[PDB]
Amino acid sequence: KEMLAEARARLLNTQGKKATRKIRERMLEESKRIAELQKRRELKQAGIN
RNA sequence: GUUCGCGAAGUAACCCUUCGUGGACAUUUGGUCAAUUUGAAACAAUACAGAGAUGAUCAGCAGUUCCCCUGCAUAAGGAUGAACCGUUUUACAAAGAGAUUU
Ligand SMILES: [K+]
Ligand SMILES: [K+]
Numbered sequence A: 001k002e003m004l005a006e007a008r009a010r011l012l013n014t015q016g017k018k019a020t021r022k023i024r025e026r027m028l029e030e031s032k033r034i035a036e037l038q039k040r041r042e043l044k045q046a047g048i049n
Numbered sequence B: 001g002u003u004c005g006c007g008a009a010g011u012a013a014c015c016c017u018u019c020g021u022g023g024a025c026a027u028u029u030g031g032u033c034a035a036u037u038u039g040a041a042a043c044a045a046u047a048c049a050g051a052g053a054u055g056a057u058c059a060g061c062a063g064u065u066c067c068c069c070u071g072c073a074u075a076a077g078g079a080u081g082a083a084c085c086g087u088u089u090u091a092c093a094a095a096g097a098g099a100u101u102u
């Protein structure tokens, strides 16, 4: 059963380290983007452009 | 300033001496640039993380780029120097059938 689980995991992978890091980096860049807009919106609502 | 010529004063008169006066000689430097904050050097420092093809550890050599750095360099080195990894819709037609409408 563990052999099958490990086989399914290794059979799934298709991208190397650089592409995988680019995926996580794009997700982090998006979360940073939304945090930036949240702070900017709070400031704007307070009349601070 | 010098020198050539002329007026004059001084001297008995020259030499010489002074005041005046004409000519000759010599003739336009330098800045793309002002002297600390506001016309632009960078490293470093603090933190986190710890290198592609892999199950794992790695040698690499390239290509593309409106990224270059070190080097005298057309050599070599810089993680295979780095970035590369995402997003993807129409030259759109033909034949036929069963339902919709006057
Ligand atoms: K490492
Ligand atoms: K390598």
Ligand SMILES: [K+]
Pocket: B080
């Ligand atoms: K190399």
